[PDB]
């Protein structure tokens, strides 16, 4: 069964979430999803690992590269995410 795909339209304060790396591990993860934000409305959850941004694999890209892809020059983003406790990359 398909990973969650969160489709967000940019709001007045952006999407409403933080993205961060974790020492000792690869990847970028969701944190601090703001109440009432497009992020919350789309079902993004703190702790989710970000796998794709707008159809492009960011599984192991750097923090800067992933942030740049989310910010792009677009006003909408599609985030493919997984729960790392339930999903592993092989
Ligand atoms: Cl703020
Ligand atoms: Cl958090
Ligand atoms: Cl959350
Ligand atoms: Cl999952």
From Swiss-Prot:
Tissue localization of expression: Detected in liver, kidney, pancreas, prostate, spleen, small intestine and placenta, in particular in the syncytiotrophoblast.
Disulfide bridges in this chain = none
Q: Determine the domain of life of the protein's source.
A: Eukaryota
Query: Residue positions of the PTM Phosphoserine?
Result: 37
Q: How is it modified after translation?
A: Phosphorylated on serine residues.
Induction of synthesis: By estrogen.
Q: Which residues form the PDZ domain?
A: 5-85
Q: Where in the cell is it found?
A: Cytoplasm; Apical cell membrane; Endomembrane system; Cell projection, Filopodium
Assembly state and interactors?
Answer: Homodimer, and heterodimer with NHERF2. Binds the N-termini of EZR, RDX and MSN. Binds the C-termini of PDGFRA, PDGFRB, ADRB2, NOS2 and CFTR. Binds ARHGAP17, EPI64, RACK1, OPRK1, GNAQ, CTNNB1 and PLCB3. Binds PDZK1. Interacts with CLCN3. Binds the C-terminus of PAG1. In resting T-cells, part of a PAG1-NHERF1-MSN complex which is disrupted upon TCR activation. Forms a complex with CFTR and SLC4A7. Forms a complex with SLC4A7 and ATP6V1B1. Interacts with TRPC4 (via the PDZ-binding domain). Directly interacts with HTR4.
Disease annotation reads:
Nephrolithiasis/osteoporosis, hypophosphatemic, 2: A disease characterized by decreased renal phosphate absorption, renal phosphate wasting, hypophosphatemia, hyperphosphaturia, hypercalciuria, nephrolithiasis and osteoporosis.
Q: Its biological function?
A: Scaffold protein that connects plasma membrane proteins with members of the ezrin/moesin/radixin family and thereby helps to link them to the actin cytoskeleton and to regulate their surface expression. Necessary for recycling of internalized ADRB2. Was first known to play a role in the regulation of the activity and subcellular location of SLC9A3. Necessary for cAMP-mediated phosphorylation and inhibition of SLC9A3. May enhance Wnt signaling. May participate in HTR4 targeting to microvilli. Involved in the regulation of phosphate reabsorption in the renal proximal tubules.
Q: What is this protein called?
A: Na(+)/H(+) exchange regulatory cofactor NHE-RF1
Q: Which organism is it from?
A: Homo sapiens
Q: Which gene encodes it?
A: NHERF1
Q: Which residues of the full protein are shown?
A: 11 to 94 of 358
């Amino acid at each position: 069964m398909l990973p969650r795909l969160c489709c967000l339209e940019k709001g007045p304060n952006g999407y409403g979430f933080h993205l961060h790396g974790e020492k000792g591990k690869l990847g970028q993860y969701i944190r601090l999803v703001e109440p009432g934000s497009p992020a919350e409305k789309a079902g993004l959850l703190a702790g989710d690992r970000l796998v794709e941004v707008n159809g492009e694999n960011v599984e192991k890209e750097t923090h800067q590269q992933v942030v740049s892809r989310i910010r792009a020059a677009l006003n909408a983003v599609r985030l493919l995410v997984v729960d790392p406790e339930n999903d592993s990359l092989l």
